[model samples]
Each structure stands twice: as C-alpha cells, then as structure tokens.
Target chain A: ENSNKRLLKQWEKILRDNVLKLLKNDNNAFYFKTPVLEDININDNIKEEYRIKIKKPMDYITISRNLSDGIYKEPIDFYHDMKLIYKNCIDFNPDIEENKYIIEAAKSSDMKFEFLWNKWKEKINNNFCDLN
Target chain B: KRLLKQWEKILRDNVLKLLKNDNNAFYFKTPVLEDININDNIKEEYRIKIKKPMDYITISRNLSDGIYKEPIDFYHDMKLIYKNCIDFNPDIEENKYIIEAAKSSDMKFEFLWNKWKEKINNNFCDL
Candidate 1:
C-alpha cells in the first residue's frame, strides 16, 4: 500500500521532470511549452482561427499544471495530453513555406516527447517489477 | 452520373425546403447568411470553440460552384452551421434562446436527411 503511494509520487515526479527537460531544450520547446495566448495577440484573426481548429489546445505548461493539480489520473492520460500539444500544433499550421519552421519545431518536440515518454514508461515498469 | 447529379440536387433542395420551414430555422437562417460578426453580441471566444465555421452563404456558394461531390457532403455542411451555434452557445439562461434554436435546427436537418436517405437507399444500396 505504501509502495502504491510511493509509485504515485515517482510517477508524478517523472511527469514533472520530463516537462522541465522539454522546456530546457530551448530548440522547439518554446513553440509548445506555454499556452498560445501568451505568445500571440488574443484578438488576432489567426489566433481566433487557431482556437476554432484546435478545440482543446494543449501545452507543456498545462500538462505540468495538470500534474500538479492531480488532473491526470493515469500516465496514459498524461501521454495523450503531451501528444496533443504536438498534434494541435501540426494540425493547426499548414505545411506551407511560411509555417515550415514552426511545423518542424513541433515535429521535433513531438519526437523528443515520444522518446522521453517511452523511457518514463520503461522506468515505471522496472519499478513495478522490482516491487514484485 | 447525370441521374445521380439530378438526384443529389433534388435531395439538396428538399432538405433546404424542410429546414427553411421549421420555426427554429428563422433564428439560424439570418445569422448564417453571412460570416459571423465579432461586432455582434457573440462571445470573444466563439471562433476558438467552433473549429469548423459554416454559414448559409458559403453553403449556397458551394452549391453553385459544384464543390459538393455528394449529397452527404452537402448535408454535413447544412448540419454543421447549426451545430456550431449549439456548440458556441450553452444552454444556460442567457443563451437558452439560441441554444434551443440551434437544437431545433439540428433536429430539422436530421429528420430531413434521414427521409431523403431513405428514399435514395432503395435504389442505391441494394442493387
């Protein structure tokens, strides 16, 4: 039972640490580490169009907050939100020349997340096995 | 192919007629005639919430331009206009009027689409 509680803490730490790591990268993280409104004008038509296209906007800051608030009950939930951050970015921006850099940035972030998420899962599996 | 095109047109016209006659249709018909105006009583976050904005003027223009490949695509846009309204406006006291109107408009489309599909199903799906 205590082990269960301990696992939860470890899981939370894993989630938190990954987000901070992503933010530290500074390459593509700037595109997705925070909410859209913080970077763009709130009244911009492009922003408005983004809001319409990406109904549930996701970001690393939101994921971090969700972890702190205990909103993500499962690790899969956390993973989905992480994926959403990239998916929304890729989906919203067209693959035109103007959006090439931003699009590539999101794709890079998504790949980084994919690697980190798998590592986190493997660690969780190892921890669970050690307990047994 | 020509007959299919003719059938789609008939289906399109009938559905529009059914929608135009509904009591709740009046609420949507006017607003959807043009792109949504931010100057109106609309919420600032309306565009953010509604991912796919649809309007009557655009739908009519699509119809004229032969953009819709099938009857289903036409119906999809027709219903989307009302769905956007329902999505943007909640069912609370302040939004009850538009909410009900959107629901009524959606229901009208559902009813009309099903009936039109039923008439076509006999000839299309079986043989």
Candidate 2:
C-alpha cells in the first residue's frame, strides 16, 4: 500500500534524525557487551501494523553487526548521508559486480576492518591494509 | 571446567603443535629461551594459549577462510601468534629472533595473492 511506503519514509527519517542526534551528545554513547541479536530493541506493534520486520533501526547496528565474516562493526562510525544501505547488499555474493555498493560503503566507512570482505572478484583484486 | 570443542581443540592442538615446536611466539627475540627473565624463564619451550571467544563465532565461519582466503582476523590473537612465531628477514634475520612470519602468515598471503602489491597484504583476524 502507498500508506506503507509513506510510512517507510517517515520511519527512516525518524531513525536517521534520532540515532544521529543521540550519538552526537556523547552521553548517549552506547555499546552492547555482545553482538547478539536478542539484545536489539525494536517496536513490534508498529511492525505488526505495517507488516515490516526490518527497517533502518534494525540495519543501523543490530543487523549490520553480523553481516560480513571478520568485521566487528559498521565501517562507518555512523550512517553516511543517512543512507544505511549495507544490509541490503550484504547478503549477496561479493564475487560479482553486485558488491560494488559494499566496496564503496565499507571502504569509506570508519569501521576499518571492512576490506577483509572479499567478494570473489573484489576479493582477489582489493587491498585492505592501506588507508585507502 | 568444560572441555574445548572441535574447532577450538583443532586450534589448540594443531596450531600449538606447529607454532610451539617449529617457531613459537616467545621464540622471537629469544636466543636462549630458557635463560630469560619473563614468566617462569620460558620453559625449555614456549607454549601459546591461543585465545578466542567460543561464545561468539569469529570470522568467515571457516577457520582457514581468510588464511590464504584464511579467515581468522583478530589482531590481538594474531599478535600473540606473531609474538611467538613471526620471522623477519626470512633470509637474513637472527636465528633466535624468528617467528616464521615468512613461512606461514606473511608468506602464505604472498603465495595466495601472487600479485606483487604489498598494501593489501595485511589481513589478520587470527593471522
């Protein structure tokens, strides 16, 4: 439904604004002791009403934390341009061109360990140790 | 205490056997391993307690995934390995100060990536 689509937009903006603003205050600095998904917080009533299981809040830290093999966290300290896109492409095989998004997102993110993710094509062809 | 599981025991038994005997962590910077001033004088040989969080799965879900595509990229863990087994100047380094960074990790990556670029050569989960 168009209403659901509209709701997605509203939720994204709310997450982007709230999460960013919260992280900025320093006092709001947060980290979970473990990378367990059970610890993630989300509103189920809204999801049930909208029929959505995943959204920006899920992708931001809860989901992204477990995507790649060796990665410990998001490559970027926070969402860049409020665009949290890694989770969408994360489930794909990196060996093909489909991984171009991951390459850029991870390469540019502050989570320095992102390069360890090698899609077959990018895997054999990329270097990770350099600042670039 | 509970026993180590399959993968961890595989890690402890095989990895420890090879590194401890061939080129241990403390072996580097130690000519006379027994004649030292550290923890209990280095024993006649050094043994590394390879640490990993069994509670959480680490790396590519495969032990050797990033290692030659061998996955095991923990820096502190790798540092422990490096300390015990890294060898500098594979050809010209001191005999005592050798950890075989050349033969195993550094060299394996080189062989895995036949290309001559060095910048991308550093990927160490458990290196």
Candidate 3:
C-alpha cells in the first residue's frame, strides 16, 4: 500500500509538472491580460466582473460551440467576436479594469447563453431553438 | 448517414420556425441578444446565475465512477470530459480528433484505476 501510494504520488507529480510546462508554452496563454475594449464608454466595473467570470472552469468553449452551433446560432462565435472587440479596445487604451469589464461581459454573456440553453433543453426535452 | 441528414433537416426546420415565431423574450430584452446593451447592469439576474457548477461536479463524479466500474465506457466519459475541458479552455482549442485523444488518455486512467480498485477489493475481501 505504501509503495502504491508512493508510485501514485510520483505519477501525479510528473503529470503536474508536464501540465505546468504545457500551460506555459501552449498557444492560449492562460494568464489574464488587459482587454482592448476599454474606451467604449461601457461600464468598467461590470466588464471587470465578467472578465473574472470568463476564467472559470465552467465557462468552456465546447458548451458555447454546442449551444451556438447545435442548439442556437453562433452564440459562442458572437461572444468571441465581442471579446475580440474588447481586446482591440485594450490594445488602444490599456485600462485594466475596463478591459476586464468588456472581456467579462462577453464571457458572462456566453455563460448566460449556455445556462439558458440547458434550461430550454430541460423544459422542452429538445434543443433550444425548437421552443422559440 | 440518412438518419443524420434527416436530423440535420429537422434542426434546420426548427430554426426557421423559431425565427418565424419571433419569441421576443430571449431575442428582445434578453441580455445575450444582439442589440441588447452588453453592459453589466442588464437586469436579468437569473440569466447571470444560469451556470450550475454543481452539475459539472456531478458529471465529473459520475465519470470517475463510470471509469472504475466499466473501463470500456471510458471513451464516452472521456469525450464528455474533453468536451467540458475544451468548452472552458479556449487555449486548448481541440478539434474532434484531439478531443478523442484526451478521451483516450482518460480511458488509460480509468484502466489503471480499475486495476487498482480490483487489487484493493481483493485485499479487502481477504481481510
């Protein structure tokens, strides 16, 4: 049992190390950056809140993609486009909080769509668009 | 192929019907709708709370159990897990096949888990 636990620990350590390395070098850098959409006269506080929300594990792209493509029409894409706009805004104006707001708003919007789709599915037993 | 095509057609028809109906709630004042202000003050608090974190945790738990009980079912569970991961992590941006690879890795984990479980079970039974 001791040996098994030791082996498991070693395996876990290796996996963790590899994952950390992968995260560092991977294409989508996980670290938070200032959004580009700060100057649009939108609510800075709100965007910041939503930006944090976007980073949550629950806010996945597959759910967004499925909701957009399979259930609804291009919701994830729309949200991503909005995020891009925010990114561009940040590139111009670099307000951390405001950028956060736009990014978060986009993310929150996606999360909202995912939630509504699930509820729509549960209530309808079919996909979301059917009920509309 | 035929069934899938039929399903796709049905999906298309449903979308058209939905567009015709013009259900205004989700499309009109809904926070997610285009032209609706993307501001944080959008009053639909319920929409904001739509995410159910518990459901995901439950899914993960079920996946873990399913892996232990039926190693062959790992692929299905892995697919769901990979789907969930990809959904949350845009950086991962896996295609269907890449997602399948993740699932395969999950299957390997499940296989190991099962072997470990069996060994422990036998030891318990002996005790």
Candidate 4:
C-alpha cells in the first residue's frame, strides 16, 4: 500500500511539474488555480492544466490543415498571429465583401502581430480552443 | 486495444525509418560533408540522437497532461526503442517537416502541434 502511495505521489508530482514546465515554456497560456484535487494535501500552487487548453485540439486541426494547405503562412512564431487573425477577417478574403471598413478595422488594431501570433500558436499547440 | 497498439507501432516504425533514411542521405551527399565521414555512418550521430530525447520529452508531457485521452500502455516501450536509436547513434536533426507530415497524415493535428510547440519553444526559449 505504501509503495502504491509512493507511486501515485511520484506520478502526481511529475504531472504537476510537466504542467508547470509547459505553461512556463509556452508563456503562461494556461492558467488554472493550483491543487488539482482538493482531497490531496497539495497546495493550491499545484493546479492542473486542462488537456483541451493545453492541446488546443480544435485549433490544432484547423491550423495544421491551414498551414499544410498553404491557406496560412508558416507560423514563424507568435508574430504571425496578427496576420492570421487579420486574414480571418471577412474583408481579407476576396470571397467576402471588399469592405474597406473591415480592412481599416483590422489595420487599426494596436496589437502586436508577433505576440498575438505567439498566443495563437500556443493556443493551437496547447489545444486551448474548440473549433467544433 | 490491439488496433490502437498496432496503429501506434506503425506510426513509430515509420518515423524511425524516415529518420534513419534521412541520416543516410545526409552522409552520402556530395559536399564532402566535412568533419563527419560519409562512410563513417554520419559523423555527427550525437545530434541525431537528440531526436529520441525530444520524443521522450513529448511523450512524457503528453501522457502526464492526459492529452491522448486513451491510456498509452506502449508508450514506455516505444520510448525504449527511441532511446536505443539515440544511444547507438545521435546524429539525427529534428525532422520537423516529417513530423508535421506524419501528424497531418495521421489526423493527429493536436499531437503534432503539441510536439511542435514543445520543440519550437524549447529551441527558442533561450533566445
């Protein structure tokens, strides 16, 4: 029983560490209150990063298809996010209306393209969104 | 369970085959390849070996985070094989394109992005 407990503890610790590393590396795109399970004595600092959030599964499929098909640019980093989101605008695609207003709205944003791109990339990679 | 294992094994085997083939091509190329002998089985084997480590990093992260949903009983076994390849020869470069291809083809876009994010962020974190 003790061995089982130890094993569980070890796994729990690994899970916590892995989640922390992922969040830290990915620029804290995942944010959950710590203490994955309330029954565990672990402090609130031990939060669990949800799989959907971490994997951004929907975005992954969407972005992967888009990138592979040449529909979108190769995400060079987060810097490409603005271009991506901008392109998402109806006005950006020729199929949509040639509304200069929408184009101007897209252009007027003070958002840093790189940062947004990075976030988007992180979201897709971490499975943060539900495309469905 | 059998089908799942079979699918996973197939994916792993294909990736290894591609990596090995790429390494061979890199050495057999005409530019003298400098430092590493073309006949010496890719002189920079250590670099290639890092791919397995990266793979383990991916698997571990995925499993711990419950990204796959299903239990990956063969994960450790696959990791062992990957480790053997790295230990025997570490000269492989991170084949991002091949990884992307595999992910897209296999319809595991989430898996691909997760792995890519790990690799890309790891590579650029210092910068």
Best by lDDT: 1
Model 4 agreement with the true structure over B1-127: per-residue lDDT tens digits: 1233333333334332322222122321222224334454553554454343233334434434544433233334333433444355434456433332222222222233333444333433232
For each candidate in turn, the TM-score is 0.43, 0.21, 0.18, 0.18
lDDT of 3 by residue, B9-126 (tens): 3222322222212211122212231234544453353245434221223333444343224332332443344344344333554444344333333333343334344443443323
lDDT of 1 by residue, A74-117 (tens): 66787788788879887888779887667756654554565556
Highest TM-score against the true fold, candidate: 1
Error of 2 at A83 (Å): 49
Order of candidate numbers by lDDT, starting with the best: 1, 3, 4, 2
C-alpha RMSD over true interface residues, each candidate:
21.9, 15.6, 15.9, 15.7
- Worst lDDT window (10 residues) for model 2 chain B? B51-60
DockQ of 4: 0.01
- Candidate 1 recovers what fraction of true contacts? 0.00
Native-vs-model 2 lDDT? 0.31
Give DockQ for candidates 1 onward, in order.
Answer: 0.01, 0.01, 0.01, 0.01
**Candidates' C-alpha lDDT:** 0.63, 0.31, 0.33, 0.32
Task: Determine which window of 10 residues in candidate 1 chain A has minimal summed lDDT.
Answer: A1-10
Separately for all candidates shown, the number of backbone clashes (residues 3 or more apart, or on different chains) is: 2, 30, 18, 23
Write the candidate numbers in order of decreasing TM-score. Answer: 1, 2, 4, 3
The 10-residue segment with the lowest total lDDT in model 1 chain B: B32-41
The residue-by-residue lDDT of candidate 2 on B1-127, one tens digit each, is: 4443344444434333233322222333233333456455343334333222210122112243433232233223434334434322234545422433322333223222332223223422334
